[PDB]
């Protein structure tokens, strides 16, 4: 994220999300969090296209 | 008067904000045991700094009160019903 | 092989023979000019190639923000203002090591500690 | 692997470069195009002890030398003979070869030819990478060891 | 081009914060690139900082 | 409760110089490169490891 | 309370909805699958600002993969239905020595890795070497016209399609190849 | 045979030359034885040286170069196999389900093999 200093390879910046779902996330964990999560949504918009022609 | 700028994508690749205005700027010279953790200033170059990060948010998400306290997943389906509910779409 | 073109009109250099006196010439396909040799040298075809590079700081490497800072101690000038990087060789099988840079005379020394570097 | 011959851990590599596909190209580092007429001295001071041995135990003038990667030369076993060796099998009568030596500390592989002799010359450029086979069988790229 | 670009820069970017220079308008350093982006185009998505 | 609280705070902090140590020692070229083909591939799959290993 | 922001169409109030899409005027390089003749590619998208609004895109290839002899810089223009190589190109805008040209695509000559890319390239031009058969061969005297209007009003149509500029075009068709091979360099 | 022888023888011788020488020378012486031886062886080595180490040595780094990445995984101590009966399965989490239902987590123990879903 621009919030951050070029190469830098620590955990709190290739996504590592520290708090617990009771503390809540910050700014940038929260934003990975999601590009994280989001996956799913779509291995499954797409995966919902094939799938269906197998089982027929 | 200069005190805030229009910075794009493409514009934000060449310089480094700050989360806060204030948590993020100050000397290091204890800390809440309830409170979240968040990382360090560890940098003096600092182009600009951020209004407040909820604006990352759009309508939708806005309105979710703590979306910063669930599985990401959980507030991407709330900004699909929001949609779906009932209340006063004008006045007239 | 730091190749070369003639003079007057300029194009490629193209090699050829002399039988009588057994030596080396370059020479134009389309003018006429021709040079004698500059080596027996007349083609490399470097397959495996061994990069650990830097990048050329255009010395304002310094202006540029969105590069960290460290406190080591260049071998010369002993300042301690730097601000590294990475070898800018987009190589997946790459190194991770670091290059600084003194922002008070323009040194770049590595922290490696196998191979040594002046490039 | 075989019955018996199991645990064996060498007896690993040993089929291994028995197996993955190997080609010139793999093993070497360079091909080089040099203007060296006197096929009894090249212009190069590094390659003399070479010649010198391979005349005491016609041609062209247009020379093709081969440097190989040594490291390369033990991953998947292998001799500078094995090698060229090949190569003299691959052309056969009509391309003079010669090579260095397994302890020589750049390995090397020269040759000429035998009317556009630079053109030709280069055919066998590539002849010589791609449609050379070492030690291995084709399609098989890469194979490894597991426990 | 452009020789010593430091300084075409910040003039650019004071040029800006004034009205000068329309504040919707993006102009980038790629210093370690030595280039000058500059745009104007319309449909560029723009926060505020 | 309060102490497990901790407990976990710095069982995390430990797990960043487990990392971090893992950082510089990569960055002074002195990283097996490891079967794990590719020395960064092998650096990353050696820090991944040492965070999950802290959630679970 | 409302906001406003739409229309009003036959009664009904219609939305016109953001439209996003790939930007424009800009160089881009990209790998191609191990499956073609072609290994790397730089495309720019030509749209005029304002005017018509032409949208004829600039392709600069580059064929043979890693490895194979002869890795040959070709590019594609409009309403030319085979590809040309980079000099001709060049020549043809009025650029004929080459080394001139590697002037217009290498800008350090302490770079013979790049300049050494090159060199297959200027061999398969060699077939040319001046401005007049440089148009020729983008297809007489008919022919020879067509050409210098494609290169005016179709070839990397954005900056100006006028007359006098053959010189600001070439040096981007440089950028473009040099920004090729940078990739082909893993630089 | 033849030559063888031659070759051885030659070669050786050659060788020787070369250187060784020385040784050669011684030769012587021785014786022869040686041778023878030587043839045979071869021787060388042984033869071869003083090479007979370098070869012998790069050897190995070619054995390294032949073993198949370990998919290195932790075990939790409150998970359990339905086979192998024992505390060490790994496990991943993905969103096989829509946004409504969330998280599916599929298991493997990591010593006796066998998979399985969470929901
Ligand atoms: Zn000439
Ligand atoms: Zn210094
Ligand atoms: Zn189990």
Redesign the interface.
């Given at each position: 994220l621009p919030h951050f200093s070029k190469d830098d390879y620590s955990p709190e910046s290739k996504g590592f999300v520290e708090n617990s779902y009771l503390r809540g996330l910050t700014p940038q964990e929260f934003f990975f969090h999601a590009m994280g999560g989001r996956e799913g949504l779509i291995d499954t918009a797409v995966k919902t296209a094939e799938t269906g022609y197998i089982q027929r | 008067e200069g005190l805030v700028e229009y910075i794009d994508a493409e514009e934000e690749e060449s310089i480094l904000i700050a989360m806060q205005p204030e948590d993020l700027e100050p000397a290091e010279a204890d800390v809440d045991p309830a409170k979240r953790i968040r990382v360090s200033h560890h940098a003096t170059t600092f182009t600009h700094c951020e209004i407040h990060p909820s604006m990352i948010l759009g309508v939708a998400a806005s309105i979710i009160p703590f979306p910063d306290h669930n599985q990401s997943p959980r507030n991407t389906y709330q900004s699909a019903m929001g949609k779906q509910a009932m209340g006063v779409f004008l006045t007239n | 092989t730091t190749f070369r073109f003639c003079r007057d009109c300029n194009n490629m250099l193209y090699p050829r023979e002399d039988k009588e006196n057994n030596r080396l010439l370059f020479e134009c396909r389309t003018c006429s000019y021709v040079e004698e040799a500059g080596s027996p040298l007349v083609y490399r075809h470097e397959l495996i190639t061994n990069i650990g590079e830097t990048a050329g700081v255009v010395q304002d490497i310094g202006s540029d923000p969105t590069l960290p800072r460290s406190d080591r101690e260049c071998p010369k000038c002993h300042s301690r203002e730097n601000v590294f990087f990475q070898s800018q060789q987009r190589r997946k099988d790459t190194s991770m090591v670091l290059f600084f840079v003194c922002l008070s005379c323009s040194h770049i020394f590595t922290s490696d500690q196998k191979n040594k570097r002046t490039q | 692997l075989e019955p018996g011959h199991a645990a064996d851990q060498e007896q690993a590599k040993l089929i291994r470069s028995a197996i993955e596909h190997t080609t010139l190209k793999s093993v070497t580092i360079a091909s080089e195009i040099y203007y060296d007429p006197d096929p009894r001295s090249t212009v190069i001071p590094e390659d003399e002890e070479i010649i010198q041995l391979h005349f005491s135990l016609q041609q062209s003038p247009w020379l093709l030398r081969l440097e190989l990667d040594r490291a390369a030369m033990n991953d998947k076993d292998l001799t500078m003979g094995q090698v060229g060796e090949r190569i003299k099998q691959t052309f056969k009568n009509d391309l003079f070869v010669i090579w260095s030596e397994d302890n020589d500390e750049k390995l090397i592989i020269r040759c000429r030819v035998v009317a556009e002799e630079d053109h030709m010359l280069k055919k066998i450029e590539n002849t010589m990478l791609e449609n050379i086979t070492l030690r291995g069988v084709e399609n098989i790229e890469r194979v490894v060891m597991m426990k | 081009v452009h020789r010593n670009?430091?300084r075409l820069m910040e003039t650019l970017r004071?040029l800006?914060?004034?009205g000068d220079i329309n504040?919707?308008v993006?102009?980038?350093?790629?210093?370690?690139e030595?280039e000058l982006?500059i745009?104007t185009?319309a449909?560029?998505?723009?926060?505020?900082? | 409760d309060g102490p497990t609280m901790r407990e976990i705070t710095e069982t995390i902090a430990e797990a960043k110089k487990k990392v971090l140590d893992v950082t510089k020692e990569a960055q002074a070229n002195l990283l097996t490169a490891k079967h794990g083909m590719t020395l960064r591939e092998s650096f990353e799959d050696n820090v991944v490891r040492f965070l999950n290993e802290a959630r679970d | 309370f409302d906001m406003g922001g739409y229309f009003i169409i036959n009664g009904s109030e219609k939305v016109l909805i953001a439209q996003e899409r790939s930007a424009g005027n800009i160089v881009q390089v990209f790998k191609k699958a191990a499956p073609s003749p072609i290994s790397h590619v730089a495309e720019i998208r030509s749209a005029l600002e304002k005017g018509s609004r032409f949208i004829s895109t600039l392709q600069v290839k580059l064929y043979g993969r890693e490895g194979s002899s002869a890795r040959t810089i070709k590019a594609t223009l409009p309403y030319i239905k085979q590809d040309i190589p980079i000099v001709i190109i060049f020549r043809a805008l009025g650029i004929i020595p080459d080394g001139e040209i590697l002037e217009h695509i290498c800008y350090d000559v302490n770079d013979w890795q790049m300049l050494e890319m090159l060199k297959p390239c200027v061999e398969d031009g060699f077939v040319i070497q001046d401005r007049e058969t440089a148009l020729d061969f983008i297809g007489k005297e008919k022919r020879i016209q067509y050409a210098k209007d494609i290169l005016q009003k179709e070839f990397l149509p954005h900056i100006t399609q006028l007359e006098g500029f053959e010189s600001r075009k070439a040096f981007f068709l440089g950028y473009m190849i040099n920004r090729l091979l940078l990739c082909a360099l893993d630089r | 045979n033849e030559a063888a022888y031659k070759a051885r023888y030659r070669i050786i011788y050659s060788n020787v030359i070369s250187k060784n020488n020385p040784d050669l020378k011684h030769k012587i012486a021785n014786g022869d034885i040686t041778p023878e031886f030587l043839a045979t062886c071869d021787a060388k080595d042984l033869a071869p040286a003083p090479l007979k180490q370098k070869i012998e040595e790069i050897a190995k780094q070619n054995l390294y170069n032949a073993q198949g990445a370990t998919i290195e995984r932790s075990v939790t101590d409150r998970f359990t196999c339905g086979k192998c009966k024992e505390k060490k399965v790994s496990y991943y989490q993905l969103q096989t389900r829509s946004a409504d239902e969330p998280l599916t987590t599929f298991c493997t123990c990591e010593a006796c093999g066998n998979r399985w879903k969470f929901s």
């Open positions: - | - | - | - | 670009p430091a004071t800006r914060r004034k504040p919707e993006s102009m980038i350093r790629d210093i370690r030595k982006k745009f185009d449909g560029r998505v723009y926060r505020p900082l | - | - | -």
